[PDB]
């Protein structure tokens, strides 16, 4: 049971990483994180500030350490 489950879940991890890969494609926009909030206090949600002058809010961030984002972090 454990062997088959582990062998299948390694492949499903590879599938998840591949599904991540199909959206981590260039080009990206570059934004400076304005401030990171934990909206659950009222799950980390940041407020990026794109170089296109748009201050886009995010319901939640992903693919990036939510605790390792500081103001003025490209």
């Amino acid at each position: 049971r454990l062997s088959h489950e582990n062998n299948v879940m390694l492949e499903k991890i590879k599938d998840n990483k591949e599904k991540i890969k199909n959206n981590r494609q260039l080009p990206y926009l570059v934004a400076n994180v304005v401030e990171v909030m934990d909206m659950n206090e009222i799950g980390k949600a940041a407020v990026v500030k794109t170089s296109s002058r748009q201050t886009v809010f995010l319901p939640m961030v992903g693919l990036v350490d939510p605790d390792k984002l500081k103001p003025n972090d490209l």
Binding site: L26, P27, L29
Partner: protein, 59 residues
């Protein structure tokens, strides 16, 4: 390898190559002929020179 491009005032995209330029032909400070759609580094260009410094060259 990823390249950070600083379109004058439209954006500050981060972009890969465009297969028409060797990866070692691009270095910091060079001007890149970035593709319009699905931006890419296509053609490096000579460094920007001020026009007023051009006619001061006797031909």
């Amino acid at each position: 390898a990823k390249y950070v491009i600083n379109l004058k005032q439209i954006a500050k995209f981060v972009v890969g190559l465009g297969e028409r330029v060797s990866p070692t032909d691009i270095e910091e400070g060079m001007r890149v002929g970035v593709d319009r759609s699905k931006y890419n580094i296509e053609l490096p260009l000579p460094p920007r020179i001020d026009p007023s410094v051009t006619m001061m060259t006797v031909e």
